């Protein structure tokens, strides 16, 4: 329903710098660059033109949504989790903090109040150590 529509739009708007509805290689690279390591154009195009359903070379909203909302080909759903985890965990120890959280959300472009940060980590963290491990993450991101 609409709740997923909103949640994929917020996700899209996380990418989409200039709000026409098409995420370009420019914008995509700007994202990557913001996170840390920075590919070139060609390499952001390989990413784009895989999904691309028209053949225009920017990823559009029903192309974003059909990639994320449906299932995959192989077993790669296991690897999305992993890589989501390795984007969050900057150290690579197995445990996400409040600060790593803040870092990625900085990088994507949320300007959080520290309430929202707390509200977020306390909803992730099951036990009560205040760090998100893999099993707490799987429970979150299905």
């Amino acid at each position: 329903t609409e709740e997923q529509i909103a949640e994929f739009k917020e996700a899209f708007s996380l990418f989409d710098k200039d709000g026409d509805g098409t995420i370009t290689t420019k914008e995509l690279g700007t994202v990557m660059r913001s996170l840390g390591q920075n590919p070139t154009e060609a390499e952001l195009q390989d990413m784009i033109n895989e999904v691309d359903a028209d053949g225009n070379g920017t990823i559009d909203f029903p192309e974003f949504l059909t990639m994320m909302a449906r299932k995959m080909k192989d077993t790669d759903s296991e690897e999305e989790i992993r890589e989501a985890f390795r984007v969050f965990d900057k150290d690579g120890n197995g445990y996400i903090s409040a600060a790593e959280l803040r870092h990625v959300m900085t990088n994507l472009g949320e300007k959080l109040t520290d309430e929202e940060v707390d509200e977020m980590i306390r909803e992730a963290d099951i036990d009560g150590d205040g760090q998100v491990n893999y099993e707490e993450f799987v429970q979150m991101m299905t």
Partner: peptide
């Protein structure tokens, strides 16, 4: 939910096209 999930639908989409 919603601030994790936006990021999560986001970040997976990085992971999968990359890896």
């Amino acid at each position: 939910r919603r601030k994790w999930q936006k990021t999560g639908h986001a970040v997976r989409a990085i992971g999968r096209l990359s890896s």
